[PDB]
Amino acid sequence: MVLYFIGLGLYDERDITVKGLEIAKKCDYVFAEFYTSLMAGTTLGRIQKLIGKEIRVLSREDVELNFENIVLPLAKENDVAFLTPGDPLVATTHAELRIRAKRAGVESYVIHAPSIYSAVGITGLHIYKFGKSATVMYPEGNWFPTSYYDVIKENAERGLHTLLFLDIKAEKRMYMTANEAMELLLKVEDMKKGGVFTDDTLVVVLARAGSLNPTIRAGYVKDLIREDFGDPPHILIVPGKLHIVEAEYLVEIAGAPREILRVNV
Amino acid sequence: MVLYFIGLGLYDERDITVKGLEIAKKCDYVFAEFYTSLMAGTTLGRIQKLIGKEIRVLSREDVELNFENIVLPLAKENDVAFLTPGDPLVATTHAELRIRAKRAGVESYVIHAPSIYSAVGITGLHIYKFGKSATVMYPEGNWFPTSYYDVIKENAERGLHTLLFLDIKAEKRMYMTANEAMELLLKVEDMKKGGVFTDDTLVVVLARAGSLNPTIRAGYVKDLIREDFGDPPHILIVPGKLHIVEAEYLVEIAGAPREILRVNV
Ligand SMILES: Nc1ncnc2c1ncn2[C@@H]1O[C@H](CSCC[C@H](N)C(=O)O)[C@@H](O)[C@H]1O
Secondary structure (H helix, E strand, O other), X not given: OEEEEEEOEOOOHHXXXXXXXHHHOOOOEEEEEOOXXXXXXXXXXXXXXXXXXXXXXXXXXXXHHHHHHHOOOHHXXXXXXXXXXXXXXXXXXXXXXXXXXXXXXXXXXEEOOOOHHHHHHHHOOOHHHEOOOEEEOOOEOOEOOOHHHHHHHHHHHHOOEEEEEEOEXXXXXXXXXXXXXXXXXXXXXXXXXXXXXXXXXXXXXEEOEOEOOOEEEEEEHHHHOOOOOOOOOEEEEEOOOOOHHHHHHHHHHHOOOHHHHOOOO | OEEEEEEOEOXXXXXXXXXXXXXXXXXXXXXXXXXXXXXXXXXXXXXHHHHOOOOEEEOHHHHHHHHHHHOHHHHHHOEEEEEEOEOOOOOOOOHHHHHHHHHOOOEEEEEOOOOHHXXXXXXXXXXXXXXXXEEEOOOEOOEOOOHHHXXXXXXXXXXXXXXXXXXXXXXXXXXXXXXXXXXHHHHHHHHHOOOOOOOOOEEEEEEOEOEOOOEEEEEEHHHHOOOOOXXXXXXXXXXXXXXXXXXXXXXXXXXXXXXXXXXXX
């Protein structure tokens, strides 16, 4: 008896690691959640087909409130897996579920899978130069979140890049676009006026990482804010000071304006 | 006419994704490099047997000096794969290779795989709280580099965690251990007196991420500096102030002392 947290990867069902597939195939019960991220290139059926097991999908409430009532009981008598998009423990609160497993006497194992957190490397930006990350959250009611704006400011002060995860309302099938996140940011800048995010800010958009042809675009907010980046999911990145080879790659691979080649050192 | 950058993942031959494996099997020629890092849980023979293709290994000079003369020519009239440990393009210099492909008129696609950059999610530390990353380098001769110490200081200053890659002599298969990294940083502390890394600093050690049995340990330097964390590779993390949920994961899963619950939160 054991519980496995198995990541499914960035885009489709083949983004699972071979390790994860052969372990998932021999589990007695398989559960999964698809609310922490969007795998735009597959379906439940295709995943079930690949793993050869029926998958029961859990909602945020089933997990956050009933994980120990729905999943853990089986794991005491059987080999159980819990599948998630990307890497199970990245920008989720799933790590705490391991604590629940322990206090229920269930041993758990983690099988990693490609994550958007490291897949940003395809933007050409040096991974080590990424600072603190943040999430753009949809304003709801009279509440307008803005903390992600300060993260950008503090990273950019240090010359660090900022990775911006975008909001998701899976049960409403709403996936925030980079365009939406740019609009939100311009609005917070008119409030705070820190010169952090303007029409002239260089940004990078990565859409559907993991697919064979993801959309990778770099340019000024004024030029990109109304551009079509294709289907979700999307992440937005606000680079800090660029190394020359970073700029080179943004121009050659992501279609950035030639002039960012001229780095002001 | 196509070059595929395929990641092999964290630890053994099963850490490659299903997508990467299937694509590698259909490639006419398969290259790989093991200088940016090593796949400590497997061998080149086991990877070859899994892919069912002979793998020509390239040195760092083969790649950096002659990538366009060794790999790209074949990719003009064949499907070629270039394998690398972890996630492709996380290593600083690899992105550039895609520009070389473009220049040579060769199509390139990136197949992602788990990277230690994202796998540290398994320490229970929130991914978004990681700041700039650094590598602890072995000093030698009259050269004692210490920038990695500076990186810790300005992340922790901002309440951020610091991911520290450890030095490696890929070709001699010599891995720097977390213990050596800790002693070094105490050495740098004695040099710089910044109050950044001392006996009382809380650290996290992650060894053999990707394995089903990785070592995850958290505690104060005075206690962990001579502890055996098992076979390489080792990764060292100097956490910033912890969220209570991070601290209880470290206590419950990483064997951290209860003391962190009131000293580091
Ligand atoms: N393939 C992909 N392409 C672009 N953005 C992606 C993505 N997968 C995830 N994201 C981003 O991350 C958000 C979910 S955050 C959860 C991330 C997941 N554990 C992982 O390891 O990737 C999405 O709303 C989106 O902004």
